[PDB]
């Protein structure tokens, strides 16, 4: 029934690449992680850092989450990420995505495992 911790890894963890390969990276990865199976998830981020380093963020800078909760943490350091955003013309089931490689601080909500 997949834990929320596990769902985070499936959706955002890409530790076997240091950056977005090509233009087709989002295209591939949204499919691969099963994120295009019923609907086209419109926006998603993949972090290219080890799991340990992302897990460590939970012990970094505490900040409010967008929803007003206070269980959000900002990485002290910038991490390698790829933003995936469904294109304007995309439609289920041929999901299309623009891929943007960037270096930025990530902000994640944390909970106990």
């Amino acid at each position: 029934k997949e834990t929320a911790a596990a769902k985070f890894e499936r959706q955002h963890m890409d530790s076997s690449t240091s950056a977005a390969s090509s233009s087709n990276y989002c295209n591939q990865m949204m499919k691969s992680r099963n994120l295009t199976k019923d609907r086209c998830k419109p926006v998603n981020t993949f972090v290219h850092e080890s799991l340990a380093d992302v897990q460590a963020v939970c012990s970094q800078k505490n900040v409010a989450c967008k929803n007003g909760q206070t269980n959000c943490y900002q990485s002290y350091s910038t991490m390698s990420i790829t933003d995936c955003r469904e294109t304007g013309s995309s439609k289920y089931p041929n999901c299309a995505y623009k891929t943007t490689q960037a270096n930025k601080h990530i902000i994640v909500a944390c909970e106990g495992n």
Binding site: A4, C72, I106, C110, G112
Partner: peptide
């Protein structure tokens, strides 16, 4: 002990 469960955003 404490793990990420939602991605809030970048920078």
């Amino acid at each position: 002990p404490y793990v990420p469960v939602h991605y809030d955003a970048s920078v």
